[PDB]
Symmetry: C3
Amino acid sequence: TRTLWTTPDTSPNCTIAQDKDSKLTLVLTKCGSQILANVSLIVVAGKYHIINNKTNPKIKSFTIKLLFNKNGVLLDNSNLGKAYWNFRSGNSNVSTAYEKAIGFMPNLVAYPKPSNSKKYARDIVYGTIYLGGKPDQPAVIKTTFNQETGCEYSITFNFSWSKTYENVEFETTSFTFSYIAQE
Amino acid sequence: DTRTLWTTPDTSPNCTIAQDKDSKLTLVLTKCGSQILANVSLIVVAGKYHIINNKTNPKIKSFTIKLLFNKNGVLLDNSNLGKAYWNFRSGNSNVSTAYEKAIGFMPNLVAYPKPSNSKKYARDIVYGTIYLGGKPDQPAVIKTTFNQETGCEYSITFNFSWSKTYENVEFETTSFTFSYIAQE
Amino acid sequence: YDTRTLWTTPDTSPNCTIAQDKDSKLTLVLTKCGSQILANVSLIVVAGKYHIINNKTNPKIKSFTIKLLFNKNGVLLDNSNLGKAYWNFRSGNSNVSTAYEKAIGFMPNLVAYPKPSNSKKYARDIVYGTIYLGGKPDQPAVIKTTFNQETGCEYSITFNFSWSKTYENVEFETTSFTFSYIAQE
Ligand SMILES: CCC(=O)N[C@H]1[C@H]([C@H](O)[C@H](O)CO)O[C@@](OCCCn2cc(CN(Cc3cn(CCCO[C@]4(C(=O)O)C[C@H](O)[C@@H](NC(=O)CC)[C@H]([C@H](O)[C@H](O)CO)O4)nn3)Cc3cn(CCCO[C@]4(C(=O)O)C[C@H](O)[C@@H](NC(=O)CC)[C@H]([C@H](O)[C@H](O)CO)O4)nn3)nn2)(C(=O)O)C[C@@H]1O
Ligand SMILES: [Cl-]
Ligand SMILES: [Cl-]
Ligand SMILES: [Cl-]
Ligand code: NA
Ligand SMILES: [Zn+2]
Ligand SMILES: [Zn+2]
Ligand SMILES: [Zn+2]
């Protein structure tokens, strides 16, 4: 029944374009064979803080990657900082870094690493979130399992938009999804 | 605690949007540790929002259903949802005693703070779309907001809206699932 | 043995018959979180009529249905599109070795989602979602899931897939979708 999370405060914990430019709020709750996931994003500074596609027509997407080793431990090339990711204790985290979280990893049979074998779309979940909570400011959140190199498991969030936003702050509504657990 | 707080799954009106008991809100909240798994649908049976005609009434485009809770997670009487059949599940009905404590089912206050002079972040909203009459060409938006009402310690608010011009369409919906971060 | 999960296994071995025998893999995982079932679904078509969609050549091919029919004990009936052989409780990445006898706690609730009758039919028993063919964001298809509307069974879950765009040689294999439903017990 346990939960891996980023504390749900607004303290930046994530680096998209520059150090600590964002707060990823991610909560993974183990419900047996499935992980129930809840995600939102606040960009606080830098390139993706205020979108202006009149000024910058090609600024239309970015990616946040969580890379994990064989024990389900977060690797430092991840966009999310290691100090910010742990099992929940109250509204905070355990003060000791976890050793094992394989039960939270995306299942490798469901979602295999890239190979020469046919690639299926099963390892992707699509959703839409809304910038500033406004229903006319959609952005697509594409979540992909186990497609990154340099790791045993991965979860990546690609944010993209097709509208021409003029001075829109990139901070989002929340989205829930699930995925099949490794064990 | 993997308990379920719900409205019961019957179709007996339990909700007051425009007039007394004009609707059945079916809401099921199931605790999976630090997240609440929520399932929701709505049937309007009477009054202003029962049969929508936007040719004759083009400005009838949205309405709101509020659930207000005290410090103990107990539903307040001024909610649109009636208190009588909002309780922990037993079979297809409820436990025989009104609950006194459900803080573990409340939306987390750090994730979703009450209104203040601090910046309001969008992460206290979840958007979804449901379909009137089960028809794929009859979308309506369900906007769910956590802890943005006053006169309570916690809240869940459902705003229903639509942009299509409906003509004599009965407002009864498909179901939507979401989750939120639990207070404890 | 995992008593809280009924699934198809996560492999890609065909287990489903839409238009011809074993033309598809339905990956379906039902996880009991008490009074709610958390469901995760995707579909891979490997052969036959629904494998490669070409609506220039075949303008009428726009939808199909996959039916799961259950008896009073929550056991899958053999007229379901999904095969009984690999629908079972989880054991690792496989299944428990004997066929299950009871799964009533995984069935969609009959008061929430009643069988057809003279009583008014409500839309509550439907969940709509959209999945994406080939993982491409410009290739939507609608997944309409309906609870307990089939005859000849105690319970049912049916998945209707449809699309409105004119696809030209698009393989029908989907992204994943999550939903939940109210459990019978
Ligand atoms: C699950 C069942 C279902 O989907 N039902 C839908 C049915 C059904 O498909 C058919 O009836 C068949 O049964 O169709 C409906 O629509 C068809 C008839 C009406 N219609 C609408 C359109 C869209 N346009 C016309 C148009 C619409 N607008 C509305 C304003 C603009 O849109 C927003 C906005 O403000 O930006 C979008 C935003 O998300 C809305 N917010 C919410 O919904 C909040 C939850 C917002 C809001 O509603 C208003 O602001 C409130 O006032 O509106 N303007 N103009 C025709 C059109 C053609 N295109 C181009 C591409 C078509 O779309 C796809 C694609 O196929 O490529 C669709 C695909 O899903 C997208 N992928 C993703 O989103 C990934 C997650 C892609 C992708 O975005 C791009 O490819 C980029 O990669 O685009 N666009 N518009 N046309 N016709 C119906 O019958 O009513 C809707 C039912 O919901
Ligand atoms: Cl655990
Ligand atoms: Cl009441
Ligand atoms: Cl045809
Ligand atoms: Na606007
Ligand atoms: Zn700013
Ligand atoms: Zn009516
Ligand atoms: Zn193929």
